[PDB]
Amino acid sequence: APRSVDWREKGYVTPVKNQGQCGSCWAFSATGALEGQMFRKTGRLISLSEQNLVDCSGPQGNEGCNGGLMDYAFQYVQDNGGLDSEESYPYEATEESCKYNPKYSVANDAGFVDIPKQEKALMKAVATVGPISVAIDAGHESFLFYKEGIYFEPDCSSEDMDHGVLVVGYGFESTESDNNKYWLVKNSWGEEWGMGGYVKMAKDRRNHCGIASAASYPTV
Ligand SMILES: *[C@@](O)(C(=O)NCc1ccccn1)[C@H](CCC)NC(=O)[C@H](CC(C)C)NC(=O)OCc1ccccc1
Numbered sequence: 150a151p152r153s154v155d156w157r158e159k160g161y162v163t164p165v166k167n168q169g170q171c172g173s174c175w176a177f178s179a180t181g182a183l184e185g186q187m188f189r190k191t192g193r194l195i196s197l198s199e200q201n202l203v204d205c206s207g208p209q210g211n212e213g214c215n216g217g218l219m220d221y222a223f224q225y226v227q228d229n230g231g232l233d234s235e236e237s238y239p240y241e242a243t244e245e246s247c248k249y250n251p252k253y254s255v256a257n258d259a260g261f262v263d264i265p266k267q268e269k270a271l272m273k274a275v276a277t278v279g280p281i282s283v284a285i286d287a288g289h290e291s292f293l294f295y296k297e298g299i300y301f302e303p304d305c306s307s308e309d310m311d312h313g314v315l316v317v318g319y320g321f322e323s324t325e326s327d328n329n330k331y332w333l334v335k336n337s338w339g340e341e342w343g344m345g346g347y348v349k350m351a352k353d354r355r356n357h358c359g360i361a362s363a364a365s366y367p368t369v
Contacts, residue, residue: 151314155318155333161185161279162317163196165346167339169242171214176202178282179222179367182287183232185280185317186369189255195200195255198238205229206249212312217359221312223261223367232256253291257368268353271361272319280317280335284363285350287312295343299324299331301351305358316360319352328354 156162163184170176177201188194201211206225211217226232231254238248264274264281275281286306299322318333331349340346351357 150272154220154276155316155320155321156185156280157317160194161188162315162335163194165335165340166196166199166240166337169339170201170241171242171244172216173199173203173214173242173335175211175217175219175313176206178284179219179233179280180235180313181315181317181335182219182280182282182365183223183226183256183258183367183369186258186278189279190369196235197234197256198235198240200251201247203236203247203306205249214242217313218363218364219284220261220263223258223365225246226258227258227260230254230257230317256322256369258369259290260368261365262304262368264361264364264366266356266362267363268356268361270363271316271364272352273362274366275316275319275332278366279299281315281364281366282317283314283360285312285314285334285360286310286358287314291313291349293342293349295348297344299328299349299351301328301357308363309358310359316364317347320349321347332360333345 181195209221237253330352
């Protein structure tokens with residue numbers, strides 16, 4: 150597999166978004182992964198509606214601003230037969246009734262794939278498929294104040310993930326500790342967080358923060 154991958158360079162990735170004060174990270178991770186697979190298929194990158202998922206995918210198991218799972222969002226898009234664009238169904242950061250409108254649907258999927266819970270399998274999936282939805286343990290002061298470098302938090306759990314994000318690649322840079330590999334991760338806290346809204350998460354360090362425990366992507 151390649152040593153460095155960055156799907157932003159191949160057109161698969163929209164700009165960083167900001168979920169506000171709604172617990173909808175799962176919806177931003179899911180739209181990011183589906184933005185990437187829709188682009189793979191059609192060659193057109195269209196920003197997709199997180200609000201659509203927040204308001205409407207409750208029947209698949211999601212709980213709006215109180216949390217959800219990317220696989221439930223992928224299920225919704227399939228069950229529902231579509232997903233509206235960001236421009237047509239903009240983000241309000243609050244749960245409201247479902248206003249999905251099929252005329253404005255710009256994406257679909259036929260299910261999803263759950264990646265084996267190993268960083269080796271995550272790597273192979275990122276290298277071949279595109280951006281991948283993942284869950285991580287983001288509950289640490291260090292994650293809030295991240296600015297640059299390879300994020301490593303010794304108290305990070307590999308089974309208790311609380312936060313959905315999007316792996317858009319991986320790479321390496323020399324470091325003091327010679328733990329040089331990272332996942333390139335798009336967050337949903339705006340551009341002012343981290344490195345333009347991205348974080349380099351430690352890679353091949355015992356599934357740091359559980360990034361490989363709940364990884365998946367939609368089938369397009
Ligand atoms: C996500 O981390 C998030 O949105 N973080 C920022 C934020 C802003 C405002 C309030 C809270 N958080 C989000 C927060 C939890 C509310 N995390 C999730 O939704 C996670 C994601 C998974 C992949 C780990 N899911 C979650 O907590 O699911 C709860 C749940 C319980 C039962 C059934 C379905 C979902």
